[PDB]
Give the backbone structure.
Amino acid sequence: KFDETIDGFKTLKFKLITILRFNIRALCIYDIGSFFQNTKIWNMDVGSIELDQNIASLISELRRTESKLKQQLPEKEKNSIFIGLDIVNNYALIKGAKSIKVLNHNGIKKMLRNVNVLQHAYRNLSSEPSKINMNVTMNFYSLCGSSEAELFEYIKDNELPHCSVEDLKTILRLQFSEEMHRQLKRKEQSKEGARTKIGKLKSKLNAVHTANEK
Amino acid sequence: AFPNILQYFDDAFEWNLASKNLELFSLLSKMESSIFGNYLSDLKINLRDTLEEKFHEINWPMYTSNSFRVGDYIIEALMILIVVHSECFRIGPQLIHKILIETQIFIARYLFEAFKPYVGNLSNDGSLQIIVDLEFFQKVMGPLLEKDTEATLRACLQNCFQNDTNRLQKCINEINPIVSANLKRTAIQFAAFS
Amino acid sequence: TVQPELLESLTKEGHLADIGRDIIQSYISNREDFNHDNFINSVK
Amino acid sequence: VGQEFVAIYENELLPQWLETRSKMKLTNFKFNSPIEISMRDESFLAKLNLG
Amino acid sequence: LSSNEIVHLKSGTENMIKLGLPEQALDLFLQNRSNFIQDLILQIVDNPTNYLTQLAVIRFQTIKKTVEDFQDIFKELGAKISSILVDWCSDEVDNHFKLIDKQLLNLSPGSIKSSRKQIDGLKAVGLDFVYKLDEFIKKNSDKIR
Amino acid sequence: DINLNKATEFILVDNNYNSTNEFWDGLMDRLSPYLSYFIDEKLKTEEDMIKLKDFLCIYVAILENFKLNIEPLYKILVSIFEKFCSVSLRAFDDEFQILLN
Amino acid sequence: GTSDRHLTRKIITAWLQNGILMDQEQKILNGDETLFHEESIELFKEIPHFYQAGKGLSKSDLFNNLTLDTILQFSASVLWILNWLPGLKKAINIDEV
């Protein structure tokens, strides 16, 4: 009876595992609304209002998915699968989501506002707990929208559990640079502030937390 | 257990009682004393938080421009009154639904009536008009209850400064129309207390 | 008869599941040549 | 005949109501709110009328 | 517990009264309107003031209709059954403010105008709940501006 | 009068069979109504095409009060609005180039 | 239904250890707030490194997610096993009774 109820437990972890993978892969599916988001703009597209409709779809079927999932099953498993898989895939969703394109200072506020909306969404699933991917990815993609190399040294000396700091630091580098690399046109650009980000690639980037190589 | 004692006097010609056996029943009396006095504690304790409404900014510098009623003093009070009398009137029908209803009119009326004292000067702090508002919410408690409760009610009608003239009496007898306006909106909520 | 223009849905017909479950496009893997340059792009 | 009774009921009666209403709130229309408010008499459609 | 319509709901409601199980009957009925309003919320935040206005219109309007359904169905069924209705009413009003606060998590007061107007819509059949919203304003006075 | 089911004499699925029915009749007759609204977009001219949508969106809407009515309902009437876009579009100031004249 | 034949069931592709194994360690309490972005980003982005997001994808959003029918199925049977394991895992009544 221990092999029996053991096997039933194995079906429980398999099944709830499959549900958590389903919601999480629905999210990572849904982040491909950015792929393509039809040329997330260069330095601006002002205006620049709103709101990347696929993300509203993600909020929608996320919301109804939690509605019916709260209908049928019991509470604690739903809070478990939804909590862990939702917040974590939100964070790494922003992380790989950084690898996009040339960047927009108004579109910083656009994708910022969208990211704040999805923070309000997974928050609307659960927010009393540590809904910190709001704070982490908001200050991290905002930190990408930040173009100060002094802030690039200052932040990540104080915050940002940003383990993709090779691509993250190379991406905010590619964001101050993505403002630089089409600041002019032909060139677009001279890479002189990216000579200061070649030096700051060695200095504001390759002083990388005593593993000074990025 | 009374009929179990009488039918327990069957073969049993003991006497039948000796109601010193019914010390147990007196124990039941004490158990009854512990029982309702438990719950009539906590509701009263919850009605103690009644004083969070009417002290805070009610009968304050109060214009009170003819909202009929606005008596959140009496509104949320009579709400949780009708919540308790709601959720227990079926099985415990004509239990302390009725008895705790009467005692709720009591503790209601007394912990009400000692708020008019500190604003006994009857315009505090803006209540020249809200004289008639405290007259109105004072008149709200005439739903279905008893008369000695209404005696202490009309005792609290004369509680403040004016509240001593008969001009207050016949004036509120003219102010009865807005009370009738509260007696249709809101009607169906506290209609259960009838 | 899965050629480079008639390999996907004619093999996905009703009784064309008498061809294989991953050998629908490779229904001529029963032949000399299997299915003409990448027979096996369906099961994944 | 049954379909003509159905779209008779909705197209003749219902959109007359939800365009007749709202009239309180602009747009926002033809949707969940008018689903909620209409809901009137002659909602009694689907009991027997084609079944 | 299954029909989105009125006629079976009306009918088997008064048939359940015709058995004489009225309290269970009303409770199931209120549960059907609970699940009803519940699932009516499932059609869509898109942006906030719209969403709140929507939400209030569903919940309060259906409660008011449910009151006419009540006095309709429970003809001379007294005070007690009405008190059970007051239970369900107050429940749902609290659930409304819970859904309001459920996204304060980031408002402009025209939302509140929608709400208080419709709550006075419940005062058309005579039930105040504005005071709960007054305490809601009181303890939630951050983004009301 | 399919989903009047005292359910179920199939029982497949436990009230999910008619979803497959109007699903599939959505699917097969979709591409036929496609060209029937595309060819036959010219034969869906800027006249009672408005009454075509008016006699479709009502029937897109009072559906079950919905059950899976998506790809026909959204995509089809979407393309109908694209047709009214193009028809009113060439019917716009190109057809008011008399004012250019 | 695996028997791949003919489907890149990326959910089932995401049924691969140690991501499935640490996912069972992330199913243990579940994870008890050690919800490792190491684990979550590693396994859940590992097969999904295939594009990755990205950019410019070759990836999901109707590329082989489970349908709503199969969702209501899986939700149904998981509700069933939850109702099973109390009622049928109770009676072990030590040790052959």
About this structure: Residues 19 and 68 of chain F are 7 Å apart (CA to CA). Helices of chain F lie at 18-36, 49-54, 57-61, 71-90. Chains F and A do not touch (no CB pair under 8 Å). Chain F has four helices and no strands.
